[PDB]
Design a protein around this ligand. Structure first.
Ligand SMILES: O=C(Nc1c[nH]nc1C(=O)Nc1ccc(F)cc1)c1ccccc1
Length: 283
C-alpha cells in the first residue's frame, strides 16, 4: 500500500503474509499483514482497534482498500518460538518463564473480560521485546474468519466437536505453552486430530463422566476410545516445582467449567515471587 515500503517478509500467518514495513510518511516501522471483504469481518476487526492492553500487540490501523485487507500492528523484534529454539541448550530460566506466563495471563484476563477469545494461541503468535515484555498477537482474527495449522495447543472440547466453546480454550493452550517452555519439548505434538486427542488421553487419562460431566454426549466422542490411565504430573513436567505443577494441572482440567480462569490464575501462589527479568536477545 502506497504509504508503506515493505522492508521484508517476517512470516506467513493463517491469514496471509506478514511484512515488516516502514510508513513512507510517519517514519514508523510496523508489522503489515495482508489478509488473504464481507462487512462482518469489517465489523469484528474494527472492535479490535479498541481492545488495547500492554500485553496485546497494538492494532495501529485497518486499511480496507481496492477491496483487499491490511492490518497494521506495532512491530516486535522476535517471537516466542524462535526464542525457545535459541534457548534450547540451557532452557529459559524459570524466573523468565514465570514472568512470561504472568504477563500472558494478564492479557487473557483483559480479553476474556470483554468476552473476546483468542482461540489459536501458539508460540509463533507470542511476540517479545528487549525489555522483558511478551504480547498476544493475532487476537480476534479467528472469529472474524499452506502448512498444517498446528493442533498442538488445541483444547480437547474443540477436538471433541463442541461448537460453543469458552475462554477456557485459551487457558488450555497457555498451559501447553507453559509446559513446553519448562521441558523444552512440546507437550502434545499431534499430527492429526485423533493423534492429538489420543496424546492428551495418554498423559491426562481418557476423560469420563466423573472428571468431565457430559463428555460422553459430545459430537465426536466415541465409546470405542481407548481407556488410558492418567500419568502423574511429576513425570510430565520435571523440574517444575509443586506450585508450578499445581497451577499447570488446574490450567489443564478436562472440564472447561473446572478449568482455572486467567483471573484466578493470576492469584495462584506460583506467582507470589514473580519478577520481570529482561531476556538476552540477539536481533
Ligand atoms: O501480528 C503479527 N506479527 C507481528 C506484529 N508485530 N510484529 C510482529 C512480528 O512477527 N514480529 C517479528 C517476529 C519474528 C521476527 F523474527 C521478527 C519480527 C502476526 C500476524 C500473523 C501471524 C503471526 C503474527
Amino acid at each position: 500500500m502506497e504509504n508503506f515500503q515493505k522492508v521484508e517478509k517476517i512470516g506467513e500467518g493463517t491469514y496471509g503474509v506478514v511484512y515488516k514495513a516502514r510508513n513512507k510518511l510517519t517514519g514508523e516501522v510496523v508489522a503489515l499483514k495482508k489478509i488473504r471483504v464481507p462487512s462482518t469481518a469489517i465489523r469484528e476487526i474494527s472492535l479490535l482497534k479498541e481492545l488495547n492492553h500492554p500485553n496485546i500487540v497494538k492494532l495501529l490501523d485497518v486499511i480496507h482498500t481496492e477491496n483487499k485487507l491490511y492490518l497494521v500492528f506495532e512491530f516486535l523484534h522476535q517471537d516466542l518460538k524462535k526464542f525457545m529454539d535459541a534457548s534450547a541448550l540451557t532452557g529459559i530460566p524459570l524466573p523468565l518463564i514465570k514472568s512470561y506466563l504472568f504477563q500472558l495471563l494478564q492479557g487473557l484476563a483483559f480479553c476474556h473480560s470483554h468476552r473476546v477469545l483468542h482461540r489459536d494461541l501458539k508460540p509463533q503468535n507470542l511476540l517479545i521485546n528487549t525489555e522483558g515484555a511478551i504480547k498476544l498477537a493475532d487476537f480476534g482474527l479467528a472469529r472474524a474468519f499452506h502448512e498444517v495449522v498446528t493442533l498442538w495447543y488445541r483444547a480437547p472440547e474443540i477436538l471433541l466437536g463442541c461448537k460453543y466453546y469458552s475462554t477456557a480454550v485459551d487457558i488450555w493452550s497457555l498451559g501447553c505453552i507453559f509446559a513446553e517452555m519448562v521441558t523444552r519439548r512440546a507437550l502434545f505434538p499431534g499430527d492429526s486430530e485423533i493423534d492429538q486427542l489420543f496424546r492428551i488421553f495418554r498423559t491426562l487419562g481418557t476423560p469420563d463422566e466423573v472428571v468431565w460431566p457430559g463428555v460422553t454426549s459430545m459430537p465426536d466422542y466415541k465409546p470405542s476410545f481407548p481407556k488410558w490411565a492418567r500419568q502423574d504430573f511429576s513425570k510430565v513436567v520435571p523440574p517444575l516445582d509443586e506450585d508450578g505443577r499445581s497451577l499447570l494441572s488446574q490450567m489443564l482440567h478436562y472440564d472447561p467449567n473446572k478449568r482455572i480462569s486467567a483471573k484466578a490464575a493470576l492469584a495462584h501462589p506460583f506467582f507470589q515471587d514473580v519478577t520481570k527479568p529482561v531476556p538476552h536477545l540477539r536481533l
